[PDB]
Amino acid sequence: VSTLIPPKVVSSKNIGSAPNAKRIANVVHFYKSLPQGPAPAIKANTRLARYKAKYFDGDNASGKPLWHFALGIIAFGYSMEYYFH
C-alpha cells in the first residue's frame, strides 16, 4: 500500500500552541503569591496587636469596637476639665 504517513514524524505541533506565554508568566510570577500571605500581623503580644486582633481586624466590622473606641473620649475631656480645674 504505503506505510508513508504524516503523523509518525511530528516536530512542530508537539511543542506548538499559544498558552506557553501564559505558562512562563505564571510559573515565575506565581509561586510566592502565598495563599494567606506570610502570616500578617493581626494578633501578637505588643498590647496593640492584641487591640488589632479584637477590634480592628478584617473579621471585625460590627459596632462593638466602635463603641469601645467611642467611650474613652467622653471620660477624657470631662476628666481633663477637672485636671485643668
Binding site: 501564559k22 508568566a25 505564571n26 510570577h29 506565581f30 503569591s33 476639665e81 485643668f84 480645674h85
Partner: protein
C-alpha cells in the same frame, strides 16, 4: 482657669502648624504611596 481659656495663640499656632506638616509629609511619602501599592499589585494580578 487659665488652661481653659485661649490667650496663648502664638504658642497654640506652633502646635497647630506642627500637626499639619507632620500629616502632610506622612500622607505624601508613606500612606498615599502605600495605598497605591495595593492598587498596582491588584492590577498586576488582574493582568496575569
Amino acid at each position: 482657669m487659665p488652661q481653659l481659656v485661649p490667650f496663648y495663640f502664638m504658642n497654640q499656632l506652633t502646635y497647630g502648624f506642627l500637626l499639619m506638616i507632620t500629616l502632610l509629609i506622612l500622607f505624601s511619602q508613606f500612606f498615599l504611596p502605600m495605598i497605591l501599592r495595593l492598587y498596582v499589585s491588584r492590577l498586576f494580578i488582574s493582568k496575569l
